[PDB]
Design a protein around this ligand. Structure first.
Ligand code: A1BEE
Ligand code: CL
Ligand code: CL
Ligand code: CL
Ligand code: CL
Ligand code: CL
Ligand code: CL
Ligand code: ZN
Ligand code: ZN
Ligand code: ZN
Ligand code: ZN
Ligand code: ZN
Ligand code: ZN
Ligand code: ZN
Ligand code: ZN
Length: 304
């Protein structure tokens, strides 16, 4: 049966009654390697790279040479295609399934922050996600993050993985630490390290100064001097926090114990919204266990 095989669903290649024929083969998420070619006449078949043309084309689309990627990608795709993606306040979320709470919180965050992905696979799926088709994008996140369906995940970890696979070259951060004995030292962060900070949740507290230790046991302060990024992520261990409307963009809510809780998404619009997969809850002021707060920026210069 004359059929079409592909590695990226972009460049298509036109190739008896699948392992001996093509190797590991997939058709819409399902592993058909142990099947025989009927209704599968002319359909596009995902195959593993086995020639140089497909090996080089696989890097053009996925920017990876790991032979496990496609297998881990189609393995996650079998579940994500069965997931439901409701539109909650103009945003695509995921109904609870296979411990996808941290994935849904990451999907809502990405729809509200500016990010340009370097791999065309992530970028092309990023556009399809905002439109409503978030299956191919959720599976790709699991593949790039080396995570599997059902495994427990962390929002700060998953975002950090994606941030490295994205264009944050123009993102700079000029920090200044001063010591009561050593003196004043200036540091500059560029890329993924310039948009993230684990420690405090308040962007204003980062500007006013945060107490950190130097080589000397004496306490030093670290304050932000210059920031040049479309957004910043502020992270801290889960504690109680009051989120004021208009002072932030979106925030992540973790409830439970280490590697044992449940993630919830909070966003700021005309009023504070709380998304729990397919559920919605409004509030004027919010207070709860917040672990990550996202703030929007463009250019900031300190007064000190
Ligand atoms: C869900 C999940 C999946 C994977 C995951 O991987 C991380 C592994 N890396 C290193 C490969 C982590 C998490 C997770 O829990 N993250 C949340 C946000 C989190 C939660 C907590 C936290 C709550 N209560 N307590 C108390 C407690 O546990 N007692 C028994 C009293 C601790 N502390 C944290 C401290 C630091 C960072 C995150 C913390
Ligand atoms: Cl690369
Ligand atoms: Cl499922
Ligand atoms: Cl869950
Ligand atoms: Cl990349
Ligand atoms: Cl903001
Ligand atoms: Cl949970
Ligand atoms: Zn070709
Ligand atoms: Zn790349
Ligand atoms: Zn499932
Ligand atoms: Zn990678
Ligand atoms: Zn010193
Ligand atoms: Zn010092
Ligand atoms: Zn208000
Ligand atoms: Zn959960």
């Amino acid at each position: 049966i004359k059929v079409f095989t592909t590695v990226d669903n972009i460049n298509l290649h036109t190739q008896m009654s699948y392992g001996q024929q093509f190797g590991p083969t997939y058709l819409d998420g399902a592993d058909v390697t142990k099947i025989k070619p009927n209704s599968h006449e002319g359909k596009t078949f995902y195959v593993l790279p086995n020639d140089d043309t497909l090996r080089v084309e696989a890097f053009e689309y996925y920017h990876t040479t790991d032979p496990s990627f496609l297998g881990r990608y189609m393995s996650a795709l079998n579940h994500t295609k069965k997931w439901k993606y409701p539109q909650v306040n103009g945003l695509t979320s995921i109904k609870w399934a296979d411990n996808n709470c941290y994935l849904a919180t990451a999907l809502l965050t990405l729809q509200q922050i500016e990010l340009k992905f370097n791999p065309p696979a992530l970028q092309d799926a990023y556009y399809r996600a905002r439109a409503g088709e978030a299956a191919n994008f959720c599976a790709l996140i699991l593949a790039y993050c080396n995570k599997t369906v059902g495994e427990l995940g962390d929002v700060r970890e998953t975002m950090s993985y994606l941030f490295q696979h994205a264009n944050l070259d123009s993102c700079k951060r000029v920090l200044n630490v001063v010591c009561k004995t050593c003196g004043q030292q200036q540091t500059t962060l560029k890329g993924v390290e310039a948009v993230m900070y684990m420690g405090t949740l308040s962007y204003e507290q980062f500007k006013k100064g945060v107490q950190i230790p130097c080589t000397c046991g004496k306490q030093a302060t670290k304050y932000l001097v210059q920031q040049e990024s479309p957004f910043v992520m502020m992270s801290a261990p889960p504690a109680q926090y009051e989120l004021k409307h208009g002072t932030f963009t979106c925030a992540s809510e973790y409830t439970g114990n280490y590697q044992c809780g449940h993630y919830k998404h909070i966003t700021s619009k005309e009023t504070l919204y709380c998304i729990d997969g397919a559920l919605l809850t409004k509030s004027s002021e919010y207070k709860g266990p917040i672990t990550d707060v996202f703030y929007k920026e463009n250019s900031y210069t300190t007064t000190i």
